[PDB]
Amino acid sequence: EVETFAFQAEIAQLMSLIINTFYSNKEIFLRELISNSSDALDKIRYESLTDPSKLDSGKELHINLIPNKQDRTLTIVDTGIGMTKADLINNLGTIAKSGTKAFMEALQAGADISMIGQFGVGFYSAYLVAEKVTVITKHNDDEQYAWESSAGGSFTVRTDTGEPMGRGTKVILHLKEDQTEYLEERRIKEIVKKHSQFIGYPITLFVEK
Ligand SMILES: CS(=O)(=O)Nc1ccc(Cl)cc1
Ligand SMILES: CS(=O)(=O)Nc1ccc(Cl)cc1
């Protein structure tokens, strides 16, 4: 049972602009997704400060980066607070309508595209490198869901019958054919060291056979 939804017009506009503008500094997508993961981890940590049972679904707070060259995917996994179904539908828990407006306004006033994260819509920089993004998520208050979009104005949501995650979010980047450098271990390490060196959670870069 798969539900298909239209993006709000402003979010569709933001994604087409990310996909179609010439912009060489594509590596910032990983900084943005790691920062989102850190934000989600902060949230569950804060909730656990007054209710330790919030961590019954997983005590470890971490970020994993999993490249897969056979599948041409880069997966970012965190054990943060996760997202409910309503969150997923409401632009993955972002205020994306007003954030997009402020981002394009900032761009008029001399802001850079790499400052997308300052407007709360850094998730959508995934489409700098990915032709399709799958988001698997489990929040303590809801079931496990999969969101998916290849842009083009729509996204889908379904219950996820895959591998149970306990709690958190998995962003699966189905990379564009010319963006496979982001599966290479030395390239990922370079980006994490450059842009994410002070993230307050362990970031583990998985290796492949
Ligand atoms: C400069 S623009 O027309 O806003 N395009 C754009 C905006 C955001 C990203 Cl991440 C990439 C390109
Ligand atoms: C930049 S850091 O947090 O000091 N260490 C690190 C560097 C690279 C990767 Cl892929 C993972 C962790």
Curated annotation (Swiss-Prot):
UniProt record similarity statement:
Belongs to the heat shock protein 90 family.
The UniProt subunit note reads as follows: Homodimer. Identified in NR3C1/GCR steroid receptor-chaperone complexes formed at least by NR3C1, HSP90AA1 and a variety of proteins containing TPR repeats such as FKBP4, FKBP5, PPID, PPP5C or STIP1. Forms a complex containing HSP90AA1, TSC1 and TSC2; TSC1 is required to recruit TCS2 to the complex. The closed form interacts (via the middle domain and TPR repeat-binding motif) with co-chaperone TSC1 (via C-terminus). Interacts with TOM34. Interacts with TERT; the interaction, together with PTGES3, is required for correct assembly and stabilization of the TERT holoenzyme complex.
Q: Which compartment or compartments is the protein found in?
A: Nucleus; Cytoplasm; Melanosome; Cell membrane
Q: Where is this region: Interaction with NR3C1?
A: 1-209
**Which stretch of the full sequence is covered here?**
16 to 224 of 732
Q: Tell me the residues on which N6-acetyllysine occurs.
A: 43, 69
- The name this protein carries in UniProt is Heat shock protein HSP 90-alpha
Substituting residue 78 to A results in: Impaired ATP-binding. Strong interaction with HIF1A, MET, KEAP1 and RHOBTB2. Loss of interaction with HSF1 and ERBB2. Los of interaction with TSC1
Note on domains (UniProt): The TPR repeat-binding motif mediates interaction with TPR repeat-containing proteins like the co-chaperone STUB1.
Coiled-coil zones: none
Q: How is it modified after translation?
A: ISGylated.
